[PDB]
Amino acid sequence: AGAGFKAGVKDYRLTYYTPDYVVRDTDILAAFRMTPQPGVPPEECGAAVAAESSTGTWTTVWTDGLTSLDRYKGRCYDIEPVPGEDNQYIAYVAYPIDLFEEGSVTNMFTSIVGNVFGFKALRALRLEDLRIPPAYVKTFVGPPHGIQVERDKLNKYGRGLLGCTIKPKLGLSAKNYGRAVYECLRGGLDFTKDDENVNSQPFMRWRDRFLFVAEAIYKAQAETGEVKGHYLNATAGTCEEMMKRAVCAKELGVPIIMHDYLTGGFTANTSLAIYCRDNGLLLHIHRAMHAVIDRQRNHGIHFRVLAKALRMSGGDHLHSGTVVGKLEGEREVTLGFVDLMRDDYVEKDRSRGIYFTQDWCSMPGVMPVASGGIHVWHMPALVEIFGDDACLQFGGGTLGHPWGNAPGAAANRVALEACTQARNEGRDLAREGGDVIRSACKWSPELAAACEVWKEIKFEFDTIDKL
């Protein structure tokens, strides 16, 4: 009499709640914020999540006996109650490395977040963090270039990079796009970009835009003597259309394209990142749709996980939020995932939402892009939050300048350089920021015009995505 096949249902906790498990250094770990239904204990909820993201279903199957379920099973190995909550728990789940397809963020998400969020036995579920072990990190191509290589190709050092989304979001012609781009770039911005939803449309077809934008890039570069780029959007309905757009950028010799990784998707994104590696194009990643997933504290996937996923799938830039602009991003939360995006090794730190120590094993860092509702008075705060390895983008903050795009660009560039110099001289941008900007507004007429228009504009609201 050995263990035989026993048909029927049993608790998931009997197999998948294993609190004495010693996590392996190749295991993928997940931290889930779980809200059980009444009558379902946390250990059963955590075990259900582990089981149905790994090896298990709702009734016992005989085929388990042909393999080793202990070798492959996901394991809920720890549960902690959430402070301030009487029905939220953090469940920790360990996944053997054999469960995952090498180099596939798609596969990793399909297991860990594929079905478990819809279980009737839970009321809410949020994936807070993932520990991606070095042995799995090494299966990914990763980002095409990463921060150091990007600065080296651009020949740009010693300050944040400056970008700008062209406006109106939609409705401009290709030639007006290029006109706006030239005027922005020539005033001191390093980059402009297609809006995330500018792909190819009746009012402006993509290839027309790419050609006029190429003219604008090369005109502004020749005029200023600084390398310029414009993130041309390769986001498309199909992978063949996406690749056609990347090929056209390659053939025009321009430096940088963009992709909306969540609305295009990880399979297409990973393909595009590999193309960019093989053809030397920088790849800017827009996180369109992320807040559908990541806004609420009780349910979804925290942005830090979406950022890790993008680092793995591949991107030279990724939007990080601004903290102070029109879209939400609490300071400590943001500082934590910026480190996860940029750094090689990030220690556990629950005060910044870092549930696991993360070792990136030399995968290139991704440049954070702070964008959305920011203007010249936010410059000191942005430089203080991000430091030099960030791109700060001013769309309305450039195309809303009273004197037009070139003056608007110059205002942003002067502001950034004034903040950067002040910090280098030992000034505390957190205390002296307003004084730094005021002094620069006195000196530069272009900056002064921006300073006056946006002086009272602030975005200060109650935060939803709190730790």
């Binding site: 921060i147 150091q148 600065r151 080296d152 190709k153 651009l154 020949n155 740009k156 050092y157 010693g158 300050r159 020539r186 005033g187 001191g188 570069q221 005029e223 200023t224 003597g225 600084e226 390398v227 950028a249 390659k250 053939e251 010799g253 321009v254 430096p255 053809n279 030397g280 194009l281 920088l282 030099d388 009273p402 004197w403 037009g404 070139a406 003056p407 110059a410 560039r413 002067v414 350089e417 004034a418 950067t420 110099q421 280098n424 001289e425 030992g426 000196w443 007429p445 272009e446």
Partner: protein, 126 residues
């Protein structure tokens, strides 16, 4: 509305949009290098080799993406490995600019842990 001139308005990356750096302001940037333990270095170029250009792409197939001529300038001596004295960095600035008075000269600094240039600005214009 003031119009940003497109004529004779070439820039030189970090700090070109500010007033010309005073001697005190240059000295403060050298202090920042030394305080952070970065490796000072000087680079220079004649006027014809100072601005980004595209001439070598005549030899290429469709591989010009992020290739430009004149990003590399010529190294003055060697990076000042082990330098923790601002006097020595300012001395070389003078030395480089005296030897090549007609050249563009820039002061840069390297971080060997990121292995990247972490600061840089023009210190001389012909």
């Amino acid at each position: 509305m003031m119009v940003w001139t497109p004529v004779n308005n070439k820039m030189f990356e970090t700090f070109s949009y500010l007033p010309p750096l005073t001697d005190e302001q240059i000295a403060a940037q050298v202090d920042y290098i030394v305080a952070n333990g970065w490796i000072p270095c000087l680079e220079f170029a004649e006027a014809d080799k100072a601005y980004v250009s595209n001439e070598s792409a005549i030899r290429f197939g469709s591989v010009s993406c992020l290739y430009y001529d004149n990003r590399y300038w010529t190294m003055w001596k060697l990076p000042m490995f082990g330098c923790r004295d601002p006097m020595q960095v300012l001395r070389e600035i003078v030395a480089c600019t005296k030897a090549f008075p007609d050249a563009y000269v820039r002061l840069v600094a390297f971080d060997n842990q990121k292995q990247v240039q972490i600061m840089g600005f023009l210190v001389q214009r012909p």
